[PDB]
Amino acid sequence: SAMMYIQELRSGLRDMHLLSCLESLRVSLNNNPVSWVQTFGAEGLASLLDILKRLHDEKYDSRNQHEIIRCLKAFMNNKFGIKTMLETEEGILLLVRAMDPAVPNMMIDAAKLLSALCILPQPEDMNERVLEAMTERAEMDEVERFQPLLDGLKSGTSIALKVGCLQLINALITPAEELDFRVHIRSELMRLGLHQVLQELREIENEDMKVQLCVFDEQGDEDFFDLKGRLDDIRMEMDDFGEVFQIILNTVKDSKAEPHFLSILQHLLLVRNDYEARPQYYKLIEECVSQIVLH
């Protein structure tokens, strides 16, 4: 029954003839029980991913890769599936690889495909797996790990794309137990220009887009608050250069974090003394960094 497809992928299929075979495969997956999916198992899943990477390598047939994504969604739509997608090496990585501004629909299907893994309860820290894998692609071609998620938040993009961006961002924020983490990557985002564009993502009136912001803003705010609660204390104690150096030496000294901090400081200390508006100047950077860590 199932074997018929496993061979079809291995039998060196190609543009157009592949597409067809892939379509039928999806539809067969969806319109079947759970036990028929098992028989496709790891072996079948395997071959699907092989074609993906092989198809990525090459540089008419975006439609060809897309169907393998849809196949996966269909395949993963159950216990067995996702689990066995998770056991793979390049599984989660290739889903990520499918994201991009150039093929709106594929990214759409790739994003929510990952998002549903994040908010998975029992395989703890799935958001960590996703974020790791998200990183690994940013070197093959050497651009930043988030620029996909921001590319699909411009002028031109399908308003359905935008929902799937911020939709992923939430799944890559909510289950994260460490507050430091969430503000970290949220600041990563806004460094690329999320705050420059997030203005426009309220101007658009939508039903499914604004159940997203109503969980994002809910977070970006319940973090900001809780963070002051910690900063406010630091406004009290670290009142003193002494209190600063005291902490700098104890925590930012013999931890790889040092040469970074050292640099930050070196940059800060650049504006020579006798600059009349130096108070004003440092005031300016004050708000810069403050916007960066808080807003």
């Binding site: 739509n77 159950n78 549903a116 908010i119 939709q167 939430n170 799944a171 499914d208 159940v211």
Partner: peptide, 16 residues
Amino acid sequence: GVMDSLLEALQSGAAF
């Protein structure tokens, strides 16, 4: 059919 339940409860997200 499972990951659909996780998908709708995503746009209309009560899985938070």
